[PDB]
Design a protein around this ligand. Sequence first.
Ligand SMILES: [Zn+2]
Lengths: 79, 35
Amino acid sequence: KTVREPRIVVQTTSCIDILDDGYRWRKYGQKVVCGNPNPRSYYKCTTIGCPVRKHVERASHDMRAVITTYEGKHNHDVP
Amino acid sequence: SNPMRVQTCASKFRELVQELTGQDAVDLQPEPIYS
Ligand SMILES: [Zn+2]
């Protein structure tokens, strides 16, 4: 079957990389990327028994472009 | 320019692919000036 669940990617445009998604999160770390001053930050769900992650980044080629990458799905609709 | 999409894909979809999934991505609209 085609691999996607590890690397659920979501793009948007915004004056900044602070964005909402209707879930609740803690941050566990951060790494550097090419072509942009901001770090990529990584998060994990704070719902009980939920092993979902994401990482969030601005792009190199614009101030205004922003991407989130999720890993696994939340079986919960409550934040 | 095309306008700031901000929250447009922040929905709680079930699938592996959010409804506006592209090449991670481009504005599909016609450019009123040169690129
Ligand atoms: Zn969760």
